[PDB]
Design a protein around this nucleic acid. Structure first.
Ligand SMILES: Cc1cn([C@H]2C[C@H](O)[C@@H](COP(=O)(O)NP(=O)(O)OP(=O)(O)O)O2)c(=O)[nH]c1=O
Ligand SMILES: [Mg+2]
Ligand SMILES: [Mg+2]
Length: 342
DNA sequence: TCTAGGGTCCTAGGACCC
DNA sequence: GGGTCCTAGGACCC
């Protein structure tokens, strides 16, 4: 009943692709992110950049203060998508039990594989190899009896390495495991738990499930379970995108409806183009808009609607602008579509 | 330094049903 | 009053 789960995760993904395609970027600090002037943030950075403290989700201003000679790149998403498609094709050779989580990551359930004598360690190392062949990119991997441990493990020995967690090692691994390493536990949750002296899975083990459930709910049950090493989430393989969105943050806050409208006129064709790729008839379940104000409060207004329609998006936007702006400047305008049910 | 843009899942009240 | 829809918002991941 104990499974064999692999998590595969490409190293410095976007940056890695950019270094392969331009070796002159190999030993200098580079990052993919928007410019400071455009209120950008770092999508990611190579190891030379990370040495300076540059991290994903860091505002570009801070990144440059930390690393003045940082070479900043706009991003080339078709290339990254090519790499992704390729590595998913590689995954398909060993199993059909594959759950992509993003361009550069995936779960594989190799519990019932005949490859590599059923050795998950060898399957994984062999998948890291041939990804380096064929693509000239490096991957890292985690091997564990369940999903979340495989995910934690893939991070343990990067870059270009893997880490294995056997059932026997699980209790010792968990006792020290800080709750923040658990996928789904972010800064807010971790801070809230750490307030009440809970730092590790060891602490949650000695904790009451009913207080945990009354306080956090479904999430609390999940925390308890993962703290016991319990994670029965199966690898899916049949997951479908549920929504499509296009938003933009402007270099300067806007204060006039005409500006918002102009933005939307530019946003719509991009949304139509991306929706058309999977939905040529543009039929949808809902559509709506998003505004984020200078106080960083964000509002969305969405409604049932049968087909992507620009005029309705503009009217909805105008109602939102007039009713919710409250004299504030607007830093972001967005359009959104909820895909049909099936 | 000054805070993206791509998304998923969960919560919560009211509508609606039964 | 529970189940499920609707809409709005937040936490989290990549
Ligand atoms: C975390 C993060 C990632 N990305 C992009 C760039 C990453 O290359 C790519 C993969 O995410 P990641 O695996 O979390 N970070 P990484 O792959 O670049 O570096 P590594 O996995 O730690 O080696 O997704 C963002 O655009 N914004 C982000 O906040
Ligand atoms: Mg990665
Ligand atoms: Mg990743």
């Amino acid at each position: 009943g104990s499974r064999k789960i692999i998590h595969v995760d490409m190293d410095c993904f976007f940056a890695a692709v950019e270094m392969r395609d331009n070796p002159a970027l190999r030993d200098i600090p580079i990052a993919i992110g928007g410019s400071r002037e455009r209120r950008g943030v770092i999508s990611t950075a190579n190891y030379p950049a990370r040495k300076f403290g540059v991290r994903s989700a860091m505002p570009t201003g801070m990144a440059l203060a930390l690393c003045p000679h940082l070479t900043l790149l706009p991003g080339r998403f078709d290339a990254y998508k090519e790499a992704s498609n390729h590595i998913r094709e590689i995954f398909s050779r060993y199993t059909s039990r594959i759950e992509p989580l993003s361009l550069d990551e995936a779960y594989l359930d190799v519990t019932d594989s005949v490859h590599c004598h059923g050795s998950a360690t060898l399957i994984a190392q062999e998948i890291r190899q041939t990804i380096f062949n064929e693509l000239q990119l490096t991957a890292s991997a985690g091997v564990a009896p369940v999903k979340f441990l495989a995910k934690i493990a893939s991070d343990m020995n990067k870059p270009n390495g893997q880490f294995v967690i056997t059932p026997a090692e699980v209790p010792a691994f968990l006792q020290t495991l800080p709750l923040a390493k658990i996928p789904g536990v972010g800064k807010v949750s971790a801070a809230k738990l750490e307030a009440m002296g809970l730092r590790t899975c060891g602490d949650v083990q000695a904790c009451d499930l009913v207080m945990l459930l009354k306080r956090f709910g479904k999430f609390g049950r999940i925390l308890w379970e993962r703290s016991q090493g319990i994670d029965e989430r199966d690898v899916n393989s049949e997951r479908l995108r549920k929504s499509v969105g296009v938003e933009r943050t402007m270099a300067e806050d806007i204060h006039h409806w005409s500006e918002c409208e102009a933005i939307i006129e530019r946003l719509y064709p991009e949304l139509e183009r991306r929706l058309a790729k999977v939905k040529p008839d543009l039929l949808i379940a809902r559509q709506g808009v998003k505004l984020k104000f200078d106080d960083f409060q964000q509002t969305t207004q969405e409604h049932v609607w049968p087909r992507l329609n620009k005029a309705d998006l503009i009217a909805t936007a105008r109602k939102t602008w007039d009713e919710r702006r409250g004299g504030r400047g607007v830093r972001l305008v967005g359009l959104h579509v909820t895909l049909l049910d099936p």
